[PDB]
Amino acid sequence: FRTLPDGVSAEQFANAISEFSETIGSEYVRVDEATVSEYDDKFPVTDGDEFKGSAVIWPGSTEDVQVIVRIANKYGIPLHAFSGGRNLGYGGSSPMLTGTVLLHLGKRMNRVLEINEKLAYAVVEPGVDYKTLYEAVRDSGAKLMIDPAELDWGSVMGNTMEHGVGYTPYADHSMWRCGMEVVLADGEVLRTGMGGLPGSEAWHLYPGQLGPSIEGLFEQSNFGICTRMGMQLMPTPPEMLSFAIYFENEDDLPAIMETTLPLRIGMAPLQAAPIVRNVTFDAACVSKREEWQTEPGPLTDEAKQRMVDELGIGHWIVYGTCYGPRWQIDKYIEMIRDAYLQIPGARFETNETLPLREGDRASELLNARHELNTGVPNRHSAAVFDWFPNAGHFFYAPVSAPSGEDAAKQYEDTKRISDDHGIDYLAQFIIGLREMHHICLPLYDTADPASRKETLDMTRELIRAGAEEGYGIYRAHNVLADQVAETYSFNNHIQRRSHERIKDALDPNGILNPGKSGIWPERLR
Amino acid sequence: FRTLPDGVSAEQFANAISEFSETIGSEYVRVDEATVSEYDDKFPVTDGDEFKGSAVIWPGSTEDVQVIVRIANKYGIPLHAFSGGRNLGYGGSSPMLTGTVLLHLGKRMNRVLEINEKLAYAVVEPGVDYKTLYEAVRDSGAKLMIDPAELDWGSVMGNTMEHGVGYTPYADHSMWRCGMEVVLADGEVLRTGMGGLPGSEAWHLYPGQLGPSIEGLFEQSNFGICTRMGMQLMPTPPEMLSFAIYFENEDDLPAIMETTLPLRIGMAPLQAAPIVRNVTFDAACVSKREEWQTEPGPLTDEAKQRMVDELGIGHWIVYGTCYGPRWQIDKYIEMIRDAYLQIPGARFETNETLPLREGDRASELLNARHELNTGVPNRHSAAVFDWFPNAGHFFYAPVSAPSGEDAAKQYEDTKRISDDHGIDYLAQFIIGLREMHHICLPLYDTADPASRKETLDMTRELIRAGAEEGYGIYRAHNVLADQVAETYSFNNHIQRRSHERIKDALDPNGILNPGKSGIWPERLR
Ligand SMILES: *Cc1cc2c(cc1C)nc1c(=O)[nH]c(=O)nc-1n2C[C@H](O)[C@H](O)[C@H](O)COP(=O)(O)OP(=O)(O)OC[C@H]1O[C@@H](n2cnc3c(N)ncnc32)[C@H](O)[C@@H]1O
Ligand SMILES: *Cc1cc2c(cc1C)nc1c(=O)[nH]c(=O)nc-1n2C[C@H](O)[C@H](O)[C@H](O)COP(=O)(O)OP(=O)(O)OC[C@H]1O[C@@H](n2cnc3c(N)ncnc32)[C@H](O)[C@@H]1O
Ligand SMILES: [Cl-]
Ligand SMILES: [Cl-]
Structure with a gap:
């Protein structure tokens, strides 16, 4: 067996595998390295046997899931259940505990x-x-x-x-x-x-x-x-129209966010939360790093300017969409254009004025957002994995009060801490309705232990820095679970204590993915 | 003491009262009949010491609440905490168990x-x-x-x-x-x-x-x-404009509901969920029963027609409001008016065409809704308490899929069952966004034990008949909690059993308002 869960002998594991096989079918219980390997994290930040599952099961029905859970309870074998197991940036399909048996429900229950x-x-x-x-x-x-x-x-x-x-x-x-x-x-x-x-x-x-x-x-x-x-x-x-707004300056971020908030908080004229991303994020969707900078250290200001100038975008780009009959769209688009164009150097386009054209990369960037914002799925952003060989991500995603000045400070500090570790920083800021998200999407070399360590170290520092300022993370990779859980420290971690009480009530044997969100069962505390 | 909790002796209770007094202040811990009786249900359907609290405490702070809860755990005394305690139609300020100590937080924490x-x-x-x-x-x-x-x-x-x-x-x-x-x-x-x-x-x-x-x-x-x-x-x-839509026929309810759904589900042009009330509900806000019918038996068709004709409303009235700049309001109002006026005999008004005028009871009814819909609270609907002496309510409010045909059947069935028990039936139907509510607001004589029993018997039959048709209650009076909890019967009441596991996890001594929503702590199961 490629890995075994702590407390479980090879013989006990083999008996559990035999009962899973007998009840589910042997075609749906996989222990071969070729199959189980595929469910290791695609984007690890660890080098050894951390987060490696022992086996994968493909259940066919709710009844199959029920019998697998009963066998897992009988043997004290931890389970990690997922739907697609494509939680890239947060662990992929990898379990919290080495030796966990994976349940890939989506394989057959689809x-x-x-x-x-x-x-x-x-x-x-x-x-x-x-x-x-x-x-x-x-x-x-x-x-x-x-x-x-x-x-x-x-x-x-x-x-x-x-x-x-x-x-x-x-x-x-x-x-x-x-x-x-x-x-x-x-x-x-x-x-x-x-x-x-x-x-x-x-x-x-x-x-x-x-x-x-x-x-x-x-x-x-x-x-x-x-x-x-x-x-x-x-x-x-009846109709949907998308827009791109390009800002000439890195320092425009405060004005962009203060402009956004009052247009969004009433759900009109921003009917959907627009995204605000930095040039590097858009660049990585349509280009490789080597187009901008041959040197492997932190991106220079001149490389970022090349991106802006050659792609024809901005240091910041806002993307959004308006929805409804044309009479309503045209009113909202005018309010949005008028507000953002108060920012000196700003330029406003729609998918009508910047239609999709072969080799017009700015048009492909807006087209990609127009699709997602009109309910047409794509995998345009998967190009960031080609930014350099083995480029992956590992999210740092704090939430805070909307504030231009505080967005600029998060940005400048994240740029500094990311440059300190030599890791590329793709940024997106979002006002959802009343909250502000800072999405830090780092690209690092998932194949390189040194790059993994810099990225893990960088991110633990971003968590500490964010926590000191009152910026809390609400979604985190397996390896970050305990650190992020510990930042919710109010009243001696009463939140985690409440989570543990519920965990022990609903999972007395502690079989389900122990330590998810820092929630450990009693037997492991 | 007026009442005591089962399992707590007078000596034990006096000892707990002495600890509450010492820690909170004797002026904030009340055991006298005159003060505690204020917190008995205003709209009971029971005649005895059911749902009668033992004491009321006015905590001054979160810390006071903490110390009261600690004392309650030491003595095994059940608590019922509430904010205002005006949960009329669902038990008022009354606890689930006789002898519960009541915490009226809102008296001082305000x-x-x-x-x-x-x-x-x-x-x-x-x-x-x-x-x-x-x-x-x-x-x-x-x-x-x-x-x-x-x-x-x-x-x-x-x-x-x-x-x-x-x-x-x-x-x-x-x-x-x-x-x-x-x-x-x-x-x-x-x-x-x-x-x-x-x-x-x-x-x-x-x-x-x-x-x-x-x-x-x-x-x-x-x-x-x-x-x-x-x-x-x-x-x-920028602006808000309300409307009333009057329908001449009791049998217009199916078309009303089927017209409403497609106008609401996309959140435009019905930007808020409109109400659909029967003439009795509107009448009871601006008049007393005897203005329409002196005979104490069920309201006749002729009495309801007198309400329609003299108030100048409909057997069904739709109230709604449009929000935004006038260009948007005028488009939505035109869509709504055009839709509903295809129902033969329908009449449309706004608060501009039917402004508030003395003596104009239709205008008073629209004005009361316009206020609520524009964020101006009132107590206009408190007039239903005067429909006859000691009138109060006891809600039957099931949720179902939107359906004109099913709405009309619920109405006809509830009219029949309420007629059979001699209870007046105030009805509202609402499509929230994708769900339909039937609000049955009965008016009964809260002071009369025969009227209490008819109301309780009527309501338990409504819950039984609703459940058989797949119509579930999601808010209920203390006295109905177990019956309603028992209707959520999927997998041997796995919902209740999961509530109970959480209950025993978070409240191991089972101190908080035992039986709320049919959730009983382990010591009482
Ligand atoms: C790399 C990347 C990632 C990304 C993104 C952009 C890029 C370049 N943009 C995202 C975005 O716009 N929105 C967002 O929410 N995430 C974004 N990501 C991250 C990631 O791609 C997606 O979130 C992805 O959709 C998540 O993966 P997936 O959909 O496959 O989900 P999963 O792995 O199956 O489940 C995640 C976890 O949820 C629990 N789980 C899931 N299913 C079950 C079932 N059936 N039962 C119990 N628990 C379940 C598990 O904890 C599982 O690990
Ligand atoms: C008679 C009537 C009732 C009514 C209504 C129209 C009429 C004519 N229209 C309603 C409506 O439009 N919407 C609605 O939600 N309810 C309506 N009702 C019913 C009732 O009047 C209201 O719901 C009323 O607002 C409820 O009473 P109140 O607001 O005073 O709430 P409460 O009694 O304090 O609390 C109710 C229960 O909640 C739990 N609770 C409350 N506070 C706490 C705190 N601080 N801690 C823990 N639990 C708390 C308790 O279970 C309590 O009993
Ligand atoms: Cl995604
Ligand atoms: Cl109310």
């Missing part, structure tokens, strides 16, 4: 169970990805839009369980999640909300029930295994 | 702590009611609106903890809740979300943290005591 046009929702199994839901809604003829993240291989269900986000009005995946089937750690099947009431047609309509709302308990946690999820879908509006 | 205009939120203590927050926002100059429920004495916090609702685009109070301070059942203080991170300014901006989202655990549950809550507030739009 159906769109229902599309309802009248009530604008879909019902998905784990393996439905953005591409597949887009195609299923297209083939249904329903006038509904999906809300994809940046990569079309992301799981509708998996991304939601991470509190992940896209870029339409429906960007908050956790908000439009409604009704879950969940296998609990003892093997019992739970249906949340109105799914608890036999015959209810409101399982995917109304996120409620008599008593507490518990769907949020299953986000970034190790309390159950989701087998089914409703996802409410935005009705397609 | 400050608005923040009105943030730039990031459009307020921070409230338990005792802040809609009237107070409205006045505090008005006097601050901040261009923000609140979202009141129907009665202005409702607690911003307390209503939220019941998954209560209002009528603006911010109607879903649970959605705009962000950041809670909670005293847990052991006395430990928890700050949810970014309040866990010292220094964070995002406690009331971003409903997230690393790990699970747990504010939903504190809705309709007995897991903690909230001492502070952020409430995000809609930015005030």
Whole structure:
């Protein structure tokens, strides 16, 4: 066996594998290095046997998941369940504990169970990805839009369980999640909300029930295994028009963010949260690093200016979209253009004035956002993996109060700490409605131990620096779990203590991905 | 002592009362019948010592709440904590168990702590009611609106903890809740979300943290005591315009609901969920029953027609509001008017065509809704208490899929069952966004034991008949909790059993309001 979980002998593991095989089928229990290797983190920051699963199981049904969980309890074998296992930047499909048996639910449990046009929702199994839901809604003829993240291989269900986000009005995946089937750690099947009431047609309509709302308990946690999820879908509006706004100066960031906030907070004229990214982020989607700088140390200011000038973009680019009839779009576009063009040097384009054209890389950048913001998934951003050989990412994503001045300070400090470690800094700032996200997407060499260590060291420092300023991280790689968990220190970590009480109540044997979000079962504390 | 909790002797109770008095102050710990009886349910359906508390305490601070909870654990005395204690139709301020010590937080913990205009939120203590927050926002100059429920004495916090609702685009109070301070059942203080991170300014901006989202655990549950809550507030739009749509036929309800859904599901042109009430509900806001019918038996068709003709309304009235610049309002109003006026006999008005005029009861009814829908709280609907002497209510409010045909069947069935028990039926139907609510507001004589029994018997049959059709209740009176919890029967009540596991995790001594939402602590199961 490539790895074994602490406390479990080769003989005990082999007996568990025999029971998984007998009950699930031997074709669906994999121990071969060729298969299990594929579920190691694509973007590691560690060099050894950390985060390596022992085996992978491909369950075919909720019933298969139930029997696997019962066998895992009997043998004390930890499980890591995921939908797509493409959680790049946060661990991929890798488990918290070496030797964990992986459950890749999406391999076989991959159906769109229902599309309802009248009530604008879909019902998905784990393996439905953005591409597949887009195609299923297209083939249904329903006038509904999906809300994809940046990569079309992301799981509708998996991304939601991470509190992940896209870029339409429906960007908050956790908000439009409604009704879950969940296998609990003892093997019992739970249906949340109105799914608890036999015959209810409101399982995917109304996120409620008599008593507490518990769907949020299953986000970034190790309390159950989701087998089914409703996802409410935005009705397609009559028209959608996207825009790009290019800023000449690195120092324009404060004015960009202070301009954004009052246009967004009322949900109009910014009907969806726009993104604000630095030139390096857009450059990495359409070019390789060597086009700008042959020297391997930190990007110079002149290399960043080359990017701006040759691509025809800005040091900062705002992307957004307006939705509705043309009369409403035209009003909103004028308010947006008028506000941002107060910033000296700013330039405003739409997908009409900058249409997609072969070899016009600025047009391909806007086209990519226009697609995502109109519910058309793509994998345009996957080009960042080609920025240099083996380029991967490892997110630092703090949330803070909207503030131009504080965005510029986060930017300047992250630039300094990233340059200190020789790691390239792709930046995106977002005002969702009232909160400001700073997305630090570092590109490092995932094949190079020295690059891994610089990136891990850089990021632990960013977490410390962010925490000192009141900037908290709300999504984190496996290796960061304990450090980020420890920053929520109010009242001797009462949040983590509350998480542990719930963990021990719902998973008494501590079988589910121990240490997810710093939540360790009693047997490991 | 007027009542004692099962298992707690007078000597034990007196010892706990002496500790509450010593720590909180004797002037804030009340055991006299005159003071405690104030906290008995205003709208009982029981005749005895059911739901009668033993004592009331007025805590002055989070610290007072902590020390009361610690003492309660030492003595095994159940607590029921509430903000305003005006949960009329669901038990008022009454506890689940006879002899519960009541904590009326809002008596002394009653400050608005923040009105943030730039990031459009307020921070409230338990005792802040809609009237107070409205006045505090008005006097601050901040261009923000609140979202009141129907009665202005409702607690911003307390209503939220019941998954209560209002009528603006911010109607879903649970959605705009962000950041809670909670005293847990052991006395430990928890700050949810970014309040866990010292220094964070995002406690009331971003409903997230690393790990699970747990504010939903504190809705309709007995897991903690909230001492502070952020409430995000809609930015005030340039203009707002309300409308009333009158339908001449009782049988117009199916077309009304089927017209509403496609206008609401995309959040335009119905930007807030409109209400659809029957003539009796409107009549009861501007008149008394005897103005229409002297016979005490069920309201006749002729009495309802007298209401329609003399008030100048409809058997069904739709009330809604449009928000934004006038160019947008005028487009939406034209879409709404054009849609509903295809129903034969329908009549459309706005608060401009039917402005408030003395004697013009239709204009008073529209004005009352225009106020609620524009963030101006009132107590206009408090007139239903005067429909006849001692009139009160006892809600049956199931949720279902939007359907004209099913709405009309629910109406006809509820009219029949209410007629059979001699109970007046005030009806509202709402499509929220994708879900349909049926609000059955019965009016019964709260002082008359026969009327209490008819109301309870009627309601238990409504719950039974609703469940058989897949219509589930998501908010219920203390006396209905077990019956309603039992309708969520999927997988041998896995929902209830999961609530119970969380309950015993977070409240091992089972002190907090045992039985809330049918959630009983291990010591009483
Ligand atoms: C590299 C990258 C990543 C990225 C991105 C851009 C780039 C260049 N842009 C993103 C964005 O716009 N929005 C966003 O939310 N994420 C973005 N990412 C990160 C990543 O690509 C995506 O989030 C991706 O969609 C996540 O991976 P996936 O969808 O495959 O999800 P998963 O690995 O299956 O699940 C993640 C975790 O959730 C829990 N989980 C998931 N499914 C289950 C089930 N069924 N039961 C229980 N738990 C489940 C697990 O903890 C799992 O590890
Ligand atoms: C009679 C009536 C009722 C009504 C209504 C119209 C009429 C004519 N219209 C309503 C509406 O439009 N929307 C709505 O949500 N409710 C409406 N109602 C019912 C009722 O009037 C209101 O819901 C009212 O706002 C509720 O009472 P209040 O606001 O005073 O809340 P509370 O009694 O303090 O608390 C209710 C329960 O919540 C838990 N709770 C409350 N505060 C705490 C704290 N601090 N800690 C822990 N738990 C808390 C308790 O379970 C409490 O019993
Ligand atoms: Cl993605
Ligand atoms: Cl109310």
